[PDB]
Structure 1
Amino acid sequence: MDTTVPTFSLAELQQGLHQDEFRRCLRDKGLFYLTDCGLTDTELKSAKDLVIDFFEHGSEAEKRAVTSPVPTMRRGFTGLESYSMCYSMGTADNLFPSGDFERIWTQYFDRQYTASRAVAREVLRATGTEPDGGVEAFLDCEPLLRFRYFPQVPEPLRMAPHYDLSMVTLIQQTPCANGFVSLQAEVGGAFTDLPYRPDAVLVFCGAIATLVTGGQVKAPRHHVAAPRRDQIAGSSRTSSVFFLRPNADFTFSVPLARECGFDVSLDGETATFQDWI
Structure 2
Amino acid sequence: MDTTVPTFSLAELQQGLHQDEFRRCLRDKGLFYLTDCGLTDTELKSAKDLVIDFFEHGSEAEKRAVTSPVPTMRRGFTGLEYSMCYSMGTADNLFPSGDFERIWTQYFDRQYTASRAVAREVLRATGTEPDGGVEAFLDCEPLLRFRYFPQLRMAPHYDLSMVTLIQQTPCANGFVSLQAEVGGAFTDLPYRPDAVLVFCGAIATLVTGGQVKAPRHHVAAPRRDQIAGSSRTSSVFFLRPNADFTFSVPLARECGFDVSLDGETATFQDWI
Same fold (TM over 0.5): yes
Structure 1 segment 1-277 matched on structure 2, within 5 A? 1-81=1-81, 83-152=82-151, 157-277=152-272
Query: What is the CA-CA distance between 1:229 and the residue it aligns to?
Result: 1.1
Taking structure 1 as the reference length, the TM-score comes to 0.98
Query: What is the CA-CA distance between 1:209 and the residue it aligns to?
Result: 0.2
Query: What is the CA-CA distance between 1:275 and the residue it aligns to?
Result: 1.9
Query: What is the CA-CA distance between 1:151 and the residue it aligns to?
Result: 0.2
Query: What is the CA-CA distance between 1:268 and the residue it aligns to?
Result: 1.6
Secondary structure of the residue aligned to 2:236 is strand
- The answer to whether the Cα contact below 8 Å between 2:259 and 2:271 also exists between their aligned partners in 1 is no
1:122-174 deviation line (CA, Å, top 9, x unaligned) = 0000000000000000000000000000000xxxx000000000000000000
- Aligned CA RMSD, in angstroms, stands at 0.5
1:250-269 deviation line (CA, Å, top 9, x unaligned) = 00011111001111211221
Secondary structure of the residue aligned to 2:102 is helix
Q: How far apart are the structure 1 equivalents of 2:200 and 2:212?
A: 8
Query: What is the CA-CA distance between 1:114 and the residue it aligns to?
Result: 0.3
Secondary structure of the residue aligned to 1:20 is helix
Q: How far apart are the structure 2 equivalents of 1:43 and 1:233?
A: 27
Secondary structure of the residue aligned to 2:251 is helix
Q: How far apart are the structure 2 equivalents of 1:72 and 1:148?
A: 16
Gaps of 5+ in 2: none
Secondary structure of the residue aligned to 1:274 is helix
1:185-225 deviation line (CA, Å, top 9, x unaligned) = 01000000000001000000000000000000000010001
Secondary structure of the residue aligned to 2:110 is helix
Query: What is the CA-CA distance between 1:227 and the residue it aligns to?
Result: 0.7
Secondary structure of the residue aligned to 1:44 is helix
- The answer to whether the Cα contact below 8 Å between 2:71 and 2:78 also exists between their aligned partners in 1 is no
Secondary structure of the residue aligned to 1:163 is coil
Q: How far apart are the structure 1 equivalents of 2:230 and 2:241?
A: 34
Question: What count of residue pairs does the alignment treat as equivalent?
Answer: 272
Q: How far apart are the structure 1 equivalents of 2:146 and 2:166?
A: 10
Q: How far apart are the structure 1 equivalents of 2:106 and 2:65?
A: 22
Taking structure 2 as the reference length, the TM-score comes to 0.99
- The answer to whether the Cα contact below 8 Å between 2:89 and 2:144 also exists between their aligned partners in 1 is yes
Q: How far apart are the structure 2 equivalents of 1:182 and 1:151?
A: 14
Q: How far apart are the structure 2 equivalents of 1:96 and 1:138?
A: 28
List, as ranges, runs of 4+ consecutive aligned residues in structure 1 with deviation greater than 4 Å.
none
Secondary structure of the residue aligned to 1:275 is helix
Q: How far apart are the structure 2 equivalents of 1:173 and 1:182?
A: 10
- The answer to whether the Cα contact below 8 Å between 2:23 and 2:125 also exists between their aligned partners in 1 is yes
Secondary structure of the residue aligned to 2:266 is strand
Q: How far apart are the structure 1 equivalents of 2:131 and 2:269?
A: 18
Secondary structure of the residue aligned to 1:130 is coil
Worse-matched range after superposition: 111-120 or 67-76? 67-76
Query: What is the CA-CA distance between 1:33 and the residue it aligns to?
Result: 0.0
Query: What is the CA-CA distance between 1:9 and the residue it aligns to?
Result: 0.2
Q: How far apart are the structure 1 equivalents of 2:97 and 2:5?
A: 39
Q: How far apart are the structure 2 equivalents of 1:161 and 1:72?
A: 22
1:92-119 deviation line (CA, Å, top 9, x unaligned) = 0000100000000000000000000000
Q: How far apart are the structure 2 equivalents of 1:131 and 1:249?
A: 12
Q: How far apart are the structure 1 equivalents of 2:60 and 2:251?
A: 50
- The answer to whether the Cα contact below 8 Å between 2:26 and 2:211 also exists between their aligned partners in 1 is yes
Q: How far apart are the structure 2 equivalents of 1:72 and 1:201?
A: 27
Secondary structure of the residue aligned to 2:229 is coil
